Amino acid sequence: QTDMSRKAFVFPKESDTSYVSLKAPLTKPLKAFTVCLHFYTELSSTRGYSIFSYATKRQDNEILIFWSKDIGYSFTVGGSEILFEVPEVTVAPVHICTSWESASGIVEFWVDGKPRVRKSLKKGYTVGAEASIILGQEQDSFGGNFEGSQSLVGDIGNVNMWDFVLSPDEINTIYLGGPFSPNVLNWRALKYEVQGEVFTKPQLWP
Amino acid sequence: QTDMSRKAFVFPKESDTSYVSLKAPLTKPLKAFTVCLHFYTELSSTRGYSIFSYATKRQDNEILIFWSKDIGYSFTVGGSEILFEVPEVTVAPVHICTSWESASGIVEFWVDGKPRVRKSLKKGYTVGAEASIILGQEQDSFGGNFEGSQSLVGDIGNVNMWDFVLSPDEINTIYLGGPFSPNVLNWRALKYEVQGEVFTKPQLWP
Amino acid sequence: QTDMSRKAFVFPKESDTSYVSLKAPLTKPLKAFTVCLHFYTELSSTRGYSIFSYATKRQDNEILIFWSKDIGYSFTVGGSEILFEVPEVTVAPVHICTSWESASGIVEFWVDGKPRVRKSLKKGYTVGAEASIILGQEQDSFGGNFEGSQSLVGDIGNVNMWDFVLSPDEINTIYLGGPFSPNVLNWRALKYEVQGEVFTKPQLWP
Amino acid sequence: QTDMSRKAFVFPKESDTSYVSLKAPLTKPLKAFTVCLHFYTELSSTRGYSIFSYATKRQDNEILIFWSKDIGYSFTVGGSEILFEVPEVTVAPVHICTSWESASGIVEFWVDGKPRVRKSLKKGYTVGAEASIILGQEQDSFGGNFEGSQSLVGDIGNVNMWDFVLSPDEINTIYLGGPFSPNVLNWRALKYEVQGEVFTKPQLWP
Amino acid sequence: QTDMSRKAFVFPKESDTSYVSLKAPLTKPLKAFTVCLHFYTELSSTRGYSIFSYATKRQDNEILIFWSKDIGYSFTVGGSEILFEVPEVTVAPVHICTSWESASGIVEFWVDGKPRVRKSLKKGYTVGAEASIILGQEQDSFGGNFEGSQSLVGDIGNVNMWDFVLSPDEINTIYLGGPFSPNVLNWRALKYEVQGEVFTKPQLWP
Amino acid sequence: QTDMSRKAFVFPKESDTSYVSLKAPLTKPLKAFTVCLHFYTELSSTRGYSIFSYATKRQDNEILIFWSKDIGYSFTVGGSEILFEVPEVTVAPVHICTSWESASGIVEFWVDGKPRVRKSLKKGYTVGAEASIILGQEQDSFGGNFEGSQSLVGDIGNVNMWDFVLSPDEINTIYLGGPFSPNVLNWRALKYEVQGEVFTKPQLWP
Amino acid sequence: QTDMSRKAFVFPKESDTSYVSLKAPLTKPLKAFTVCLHFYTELSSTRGYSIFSYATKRQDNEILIFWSKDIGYSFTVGGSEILFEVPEVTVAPVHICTSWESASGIVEFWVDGKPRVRKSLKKGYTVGAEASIILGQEQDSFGGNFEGSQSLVGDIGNVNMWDFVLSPDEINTIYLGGPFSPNVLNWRALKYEVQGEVFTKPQLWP
Amino acid sequence: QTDMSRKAFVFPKESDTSYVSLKAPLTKPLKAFTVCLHFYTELSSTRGYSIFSYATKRQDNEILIFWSKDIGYSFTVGGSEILFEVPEVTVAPVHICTSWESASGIVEFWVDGKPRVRKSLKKGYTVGAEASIILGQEQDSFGGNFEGSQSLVGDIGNVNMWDFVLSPDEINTIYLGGPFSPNVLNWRALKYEVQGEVFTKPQLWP
Amino acid sequence: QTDMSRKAFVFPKESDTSYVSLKAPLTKPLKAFTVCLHFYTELSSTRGYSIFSYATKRQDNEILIFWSKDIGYSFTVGGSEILFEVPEVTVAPVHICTSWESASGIVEFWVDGKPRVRKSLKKGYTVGAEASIILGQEQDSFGGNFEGSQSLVGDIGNVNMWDFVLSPDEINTIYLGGPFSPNVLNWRALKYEVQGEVFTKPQLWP
Ligand SMILES: [Ca+2]
Ligand SMILES: [Ca+2]
Ligand SMILES: [Ca+2]
Ligand SMILES: [Ca+2]
Ligand SMILES: [Ca+2]
Ligand SMILES: [Ca+2]
Ligand SMILES: [Ca+2]
Ligand SMILES: [Ca+2]
Ligand SMILES: [Ca+2]
Ligand SMILES: [Ca+2]
Ligand SMILES: [Ca+2]
Ligand SMILES: [Ca+2]
Ligand SMILES: [Ca+2]
Ligand SMILES: [Ca+2]
Ligand SMILES: [Ca+2]
Ligand SMILES: [Ca+2]
Ligand SMILES: [Ca+2]
Ligand SMILES: [Ca+2]
């Protein structure tokens, strides 16, 4: 487990080969989760891109966070998709947190510390534990079949995951940088494998 | 009775069946009132929605606070309506307080701590005591006849009601989160009944 | 009827002449009652004081709520007395309710929404209907013989009286603020007479 | 003398009936004046309205402060007009102070503490002392000939008048709140008569 | 007139010479007032200090707010004094408001948004308008005769004064930082002169 | 069976004759049990009192939960005593659960949802099924020989009994009042007999 | 291998014969370790007790965690002792982690997620791996010479051991119960042997 | 430059030889500064210790932050001292910030985000740039003459220095851990030398 | 070597002859660099201009920073170009820092302390040490062939160059003006030669 504090993966070219695969000690199938990350890309006005790709062997889009061009953030669980439309997008680094819960299907999407309206997705589902988590690519088989037109170009980091819905006050601390302890995926205790053109650099954002 | 402090009702799907009914053991009919609430919805650019629906057996729109698409807040008492145009609407949680006084018919509207101009409505009327108070739906009968195209989708909370017109100083206190004692409807002491897909969650707003 | 909402009687000096007399439209003898009031004084560590003095021509302490120095609340009906010991007192406004029922002699005493243990007093007694109800003084005859060392110095308000025992849920709504209608003594519809140095001011408490 | 402090006149419906007439003690003719007031209305996008209408039997527009649609503040003295163009107008309470000095004809117009450029009007004129001062209406005769399309709808208050030009420092105190003593017309010592549907309510602005 | 917003006067050493003199062009003598301020000092356990000194040529203690060691706040008008005993005192900035009304003599005292019990002082008195208002020192003559053993050491700011008794709602607004307009002494519109070692610094309190 | 839900037995006087006897549908001898209740009394600092008195014809203290002054909860099974000492006691309603298992003699004691340390008592013993269960008194014969100095004065309710050790999770749901189904003694299906001055009143605790 | 998840060893009586012996699948002598556990006991105010006794055939206090009465946690490695003093003790379940590194000799001690100051012990030592690990007793030979005056009475569980110093992040995840993999001694894969009066019960603590 | 982020120096034993020497790229003499650090020690109950020692060849205590037993923090500049008395000290990590300004001599002292009252020290002085900055020891000559009785035993970290007084908002960001850029001494870009028995470890505090 | 602190080269006319030539005492070929500068120009609306032209004998655009009209900053290394689109412009002094690194080709570009996204250029290239560095012109031979339509009109200063990629923290200090030491090209130790109409004046930007 490597401490990635202050460091980001840099995907500086559009390619289908550059990815990092993140390994989770996930012994339990998820009835709920939170995932937070920073990313920074100019693609938003050019095309869509994968922000966070989680696949199980049953389902290649088991959790996917996707920027869809001229629409905004696609969020999907279990192949069902919900849109958090963003009309005005700016070239600045952006922090997101996204939370889903099976018991209600309530999705919380948060951008730069501001909540979106809570929406319903995949009530009663469960996310499988045996999963491939990939940054930089959108995967259509378990660990592969990326499309370069869906790759990330630029930076991603502070990828942190919990198997529970963070409260709003917790997510506020995350955005401010208060202390927290992720229990599914910890940027401060990252297990990862790097493939292709990916560089680790000091994070650009504060 | 339940202390809903820091909690909101989440209405995460469009439906004709999700609602909460709030009980007031109100004895005297209302010659005046104030109602204050937080709500959060993205619908404001899509369609109209009921924020706060108070009906009596004579009158289904006995007090109704309604967002009307491309206009703003619609306020009606005893079935008569006045409008507070909102030319720019922005996706953020909004606090509103509204007061009506029979003796003058003056309606007061405050949004996020700012008053609208005092308008006149239903001078000399009296609001019936035997009431059905419904959140998340607009009712066209005493306890029913909802239209799904008028449901609230999103959050409503801090619902407080007084049988008198609050002064501006009091309303400033409410918005700042000073202490107060609502004497008709009280979030700290709420008696309510839930139907359909409705969930109690930590409030998104401070 | 005068609506005393948000107003309190202020007794800002020690005297034996400042009092207010409250006129009850009461003619049936009380087989039970609840009396609730809010009050605020600095005397509690200095000396005892009358909170609520109800006298009948046969009995000057027919209902008396009395603070007794370094003891607590003294509650007495028909001259008999019981104590609700209070080992620590804090300088904040205090709201009390107390209920007595002849059919059981059970006294309930409630301070700031917390019940005291139920105690037995004057089972089968009756409280006279023709009463002199006085605030600010303790009376040893029908409307007179006040002692300045027993006067309330400070504020008293929200004085409500019922000829029946309120349930705990009702007492909770009294404390928190919700709707209620007293049928013996109503703050919203008070009949009172002021004598001496007494002022009506905005209540300090919410 | 009536203290209207913290109170406003409310004109909640369009009519020619609703007006209030203010009585100045003024004996001397005015060689200079300042008039300051708070008003709040949503009409500014819809039609013109009279803000302040000092009239004399010789001259119905002896001093008139008038909102002209899509133009701004019409300021006229002795029937001669000047405009302070306002290209962007926003629905919020607005404080104005206006000064006229005969010895130079200089008009100072101030809005929310910002000066407009000084303009020349009626140099060497004199404003008649025997005057009818009306709020809520524009008068074309010494006490009448109102027109509904010129009536104020909304709130007006803090109407103070001096027979001299306040300095910028003084006007800054008027806007921010400090101590001042008007000698022609004092809101804290006002003589007025109400006609029609006009109400006195707590001012919405600080 | 300086906008002292977010600034405080810092009195960092004991002296008989560091003071600021606050200028009010007050014409009417005061039948009532409210004064509110923040201050911060460690002296409270060591010795008494003047918080707010208002003197006339007739009366050096016309308004004085004083800390008395091991007693608490001393409030005096016209030389007559009342105490608001503070048995536990903590090393933090403290906001106070205090109100006096001649007509009743009622003194209100508020500390960090909690009211003290209303007390009586100098009923029927009138506070002189020609006044010397000094922060940091205690006057024994008009503008002079300071005692270093009574000087404030530390910070004072947000000094606002009204010539009327603020309601509890208003004071709650003040303490919460709601908008308000002081009509005697305005921190946003302060005219003052500084003598000796006194500095303007960013306020330590929110 | 009477549904005692929301009701408590009230023992408002010290007496040797006020008691209720609860009838158990028990048939097997108890090799284990759990007993849970709320009670409320002021005696704790004044004298001991019997909380729960279970006697078989062989053994008057076959299960006894007893408060002993200056010590705490006496728990006895088969006549043998262990103490869960309580140095700091506060006058508030207290919930307890206590469990015993013959297979190990482990006693679990729980106060207000917090476990005491597990202690050992009467391993291999058997509790008789023919039992007089009495609330309000300590019985020294099968159903009698009460003592005034050991009577409960105050309120006892939610008396539930299981013939097995509840897990911590179950006891947590009991403390939260969740769905639970007792099978030796059931408040929601209570067979009982009332003797002397005992009253049924709404429970004071939530 | 037994998964002891949610279970604790209960030592419910004082004895010198009740112990559980834990078998470590280890051969490498330890240059560093971390040990974590929950325990719950009332002894702390009565006497000291062994929490964790690790003995090699040369050294019976090779690692020992010992509560020292009125002092606190004794920690000793290779027979050298350090104390982490705890002046006041609450009767509650307590989680501790302690780490030692030979290279620096730094001892970390953590109670309920709060670190003690790092201290030095046995720099350059090495702990033998051919070790007997006993819970419930202090051992003065490789498997015996227990003293009942040093036995644990109560509960001990979640006993996990690493041959490396856990980071503060990892320890936070232990205390929060996140995922972790012990490599010397694992509660989820415990190999153990029970002697005397010891029971396996559901853990009382979360 | 070494990024010490999340690392602390550990001084686990008392010695007169363990220190870290910090080098500032500072060439202009300081007219103002801010010093912020975390430290963690148990010595505070037991003896005094140096926290931060800044010497110039003319002046061994040109800046000294010192804990003096029973007194509290000693802050000295140019060899003059002021005390920030601390009556009760608890064993927890403490963050401090301290500021000095020549022009006023105002010292700000901040503990765990709470400001002390501003004090005066060395008005008009200046601090030399030819300086030796040592952690862990108190120095009485430019680089040496330590005392073991004044050494820090424990952890020190997050040492940042500015040549200007940080505003209260800035210091609040430092305490919260918002982004900041030092310009004299920078933990993220630290130039230091380690001497004696000292270790670098992950910081125990968040 | 001249200390140019607070000074700037002023190019007050368009010409093909005004330039200043900067000499780097550089011996190693540059595997990486950072260049930071301030410039101020009106040209941005009107035509492109050379900000910083670095040419080796092989390559007249070995490093060039160029404003390209309507596009933004052209950055080119070894004659290959990447664009940082700037769709909105303000006529103000602008600080840029740009870094390149052969080992990845990653270019960083920073404007007024805000990073652009990292882009790849000239991976594995090497930049010749023996170069002419010209401010005010674009150079198409080694030291000449300037085009007036590409000259800088206005101000250039604070030109600092490093042969390594500054971290974000460092670049932040550069923008804030924290202390730094450039090892290729140092404004505070500049070797330069001036040709044509160029002046040195106090820098307009702070
Ligand atoms: Ca795909
Ligand atoms: Ca896919
Ligand atoms: Ca309807
Ligand atoms: Ca409808
Ligand atoms: Ca009496
Ligand atoms: Ca008496
Ligand atoms: Ca007209
Ligand atoms: Ca006219
Ligand atoms: Ca004096
Ligand atoms: Ca004096
Ligand atoms: Ca007995
Ligand atoms: Ca017995
Ligand atoms: Ca041993
Ligand atoms: Ca031993
Ligand atoms: Ca020294
Ligand atoms: Ca020394
Ligand atoms: Ca070229
Ligand atoms: Ca060219």
Curated annotation (Swiss-Prot), chains A, B, C, D, E, F, G, H, I:
One of its GO terms (molecular function) is low-density lipoprotein particle receptor binding. Ca(2+) 1 binds at D60, N61, E138, Q139, D140. Gene3D superfamilies: 2.60.120.200. PROSITE patterns: PTX_1, PTX_2. Induction: The concentration of CRP in plasma increases greatly during acute phase response to tissue injury, infection or other inflammatory stimuli. It is induced by IL1/interleukin-1 and IL6/interleukin-6. Disulfide bonds join C36-C97. Its main location: secreted. Residues 5-206 form the Pentraxin (PTX) domain. The keyword Secreted applies. Its cofactor is Ca(2+). Binds 2 calcium ions per subunit. Found in plasma. It is found in: Secreted. InterPro entries: ConA-like_dom_sf, Pentaxin_CS, Pentraxin-related, Pentraxin_domain. Ca(2+) 2 binds at E138, D140, Q150. Keywords: Acute phase, Calcium, Disulfide bond, Metal-binding, Pyrrolidone carboxylic acid, Secreted, Signal. Displays several functions associated with host defense: it promotes agglutination, bacterial capsular swelling, phagocytosis and complement fixation through its calcium-dependent binding to phosphorylcholine. Can interact with DNA and histones and may scavenge nuclear material released from damaged circulating cells. Belongs to the pentraxin family. This protein owes its name to its ability precipitate pneumococcal C-polysaccharide in the presence of calcium. This is C-reactive protein.
